[PDB]
């Protein structure tokens, strides 16, 4: 009937074809066919990506790969509860008005001028997206930006609007690249290659600090805003109070425990996933301090993502179990050896940067990381490099707003020409490809 | 500071005392102390029961019982995803207006009279609570009941209001006793003793069909309503349409697969948790049919419960690992042998029926089932009997509304005297104790 309902049927037909017409052994054919099915379903977004994540275990069981519980156990990877603690921190610092207070105090650092306010705004937006999200952050900042522009004389001056808006969106999508929380794809990568919070900050904080000013400069040089007015702000200059102090303290304590996870856990007994224990402890300290109630943590969090992680991990453990990964590596050895690694990561990064502009970041990541990682390539291991690269690229969505929630949230204003966004995102995607290639070549090797 | 924040500290002090002043071996002392801590936290409801469920794994790890992942894996017991499919069915049959249509078509079965409408109402409320919930069901039926009574002449006639209302509440709480879904405690019991959907219906459907008419009769004989008026109904006589037909069909197919799980799964390969695969398949069929979107399944479901299941299961696996269960059985052997099993289940059932009137059903169940089951008693195994008994009793909340969501949802009307509810619930709780004792003695043995 509907378009998606026919995409699903075509995908079933393709699955059956590959299940009947492949000259590989049964198990590898099964893995490949499941992979194609799941990819066609995640990219097209026919079924809500979470539903496909839930179908992966069923597709694995009905075909005798996994036992039911051994497949559903992947919906409980410690990384998921780490992300849950992150969502709880977000719910706290939104219910207690902490983010508004931070952004406002920053807007005061700039007395009344714009030339410095939008830059501080991008910076704070990224600092938030480090923890909260990519969507809620943009939604929280949008009214602030509009109140800022309230005295811009928005007539034949749409350029400054587009600047102050796309800067916010991209700053969020980029601050999502600094922490394991902030953007799902980072957590998918870590779960696949076993990375810790700080072991991923060492990859994502420099990358973001490099990609954010590059983006602001590219925008300022593509569109030419004036940025010379003043601030006729009239909202309440909110102040600190109990509940925000405690929330900030617990937030800082959680971050301090995360960053220093290794020495602490080494001086405590050597727990396995100390970061996740720290996140659950953040939840416990926020509850014991009466600063946030579970109903908020439940309305706020996005559990579809917490099921998508499990789906991606079940897919990875499938490709690992049925031996499909080693076969794909044996098959791609020739192509990876003929050319170099630099061109390999170049094509990978461009593919992913131009894919998530049509698909969802989390789905593309969950689908691609397992392959390029579980391959265990021959000419060069680089098993974490590519995972981090893809997780970063999947967040580099800068073209049309259907690619990322924040882009649409900011496009809803009604004065962002699609063509300007598209060309700016093209320039930015090329720049990000180049930058990621450079970093992967120099730093991460 | 606050009452709950001091309860927590007293509980920590008690935990430390038992951790320092018990003449049992270290591990059993640890288990007992964790048990006391968690019980004091779940009964008092200081921290949202979900938060205590989340604290159980941390409390188990920081004290070296479990590895982190081996403890968090219990948040993915197939029973949880079964309950998730149940929540999805509820979201479908609420978003597609199926429940309203069913209740209205039933209200038409009674032409315009009341003497038969309230009984059909209790019946349909139970039939719904079989699947949807105990709370949403009462909330969905309340406006219908008020529109029914709109022509009751509710002056010196509060008796019929209380009847048509408490009947609804108790019918929901009892229909929650027929299926694994419908009430969490049933799922906790099954997870503890490995019960299937039908293997638990064989316990819960007769029990509910017996306890519901008993309750209606007790009410009719305590308070004396008239039940003689007509129906001046004026709402829209809704009709069927596409979306409701498909939803009903998928619902019936899911139920037919659940009930006949054994022969099917035996003629298919012998999967381990076929019921859970069937629930996930229900989600998949509801999504593929474009009848419900994940956002509704996420707003609707109660994930706190899906974490509470994991908390209770981690507690059970703790008491099993540290050897506390066998020790408690060795200690209670004398008391269980001196008296009989009949008196044992009698005291158990009364304790639980009068406990959940102050605590939450799910928490009391999650706390008590592990003990009385993992004991593996000496004089008589009865390892599933007591689990089912406690799961049924925990739903038998009939006194003051703070015990159960539905009771408060119906008390909000503003014309339900606390004393009448309390005495009616006392009578009903005694009757339910007697009935459960009788059934456990005759049928389940």
Author numbering:
A (entry chain C), B (entry chain A): 18 to 462
Show passages lifted from the paper.
The mammalian SLC13 proteins are members of the larger divalent-anion sodium symporter (DASS) family. DASS proteins typically have a molecular weight of 45–65 kDa and form obligate homodimers. Each protomer consists of a scaffold and a transport domain. Structural information, along with cross-linking and computer modeling, indicates that DASS proteins operate in an elevator-type transport mechanism (Reyes et al., 2009; Drew and Boudker, 2016; Garaeva and Slotboom, 2020).
To obtain the structure of a DASS protein in a substrate-free, Na+-bound state, we purified VcINDY in 100 mM Na+, but in the absence of a substrate, for single-particle cryo-electron microscopy (cryo-EM). In a parallel approach, we used amphipol polymer to preserve the transporter protein, which allowed data collection on particularly thin ice to maximize signal-to-noise. This VcINDY structure in amphipol, without Fab, was determined to 3.16 Å resolution. The two cryo-EM structures of VcINDY are in a substrate-free, inward-facing (Ci-Na+) state and provide an opportunity to describe the conformational changes that occur upon substrate release. The Ci-Na+ VcINDY structures are very similar to each other, with an r.m.s.d of 0.75 Å. Comparison of the previous Ci-Na+-S and amphipol preserved Ci-Na+ VcINDY structures also revealed prominent changes on the periplasmic surface. The loop connecting HPoutb and TM10a, from Ala395 to Pro400, has moved on the periplasmic surface. The C-terminus of HPoutb also unwinds by one turn (Val392 – Glu394) in the amphipol structure. As a result, the conserved salt bridge between Glu394 with Lys337 of H9b from the scaffold domain breaks, and Phe396 moves away from its contact with H9c. Finally, the side chain of Trp461 is inserted between TM6, TM10a and TM11, packing against another conserved aromatic residue, Phe220.
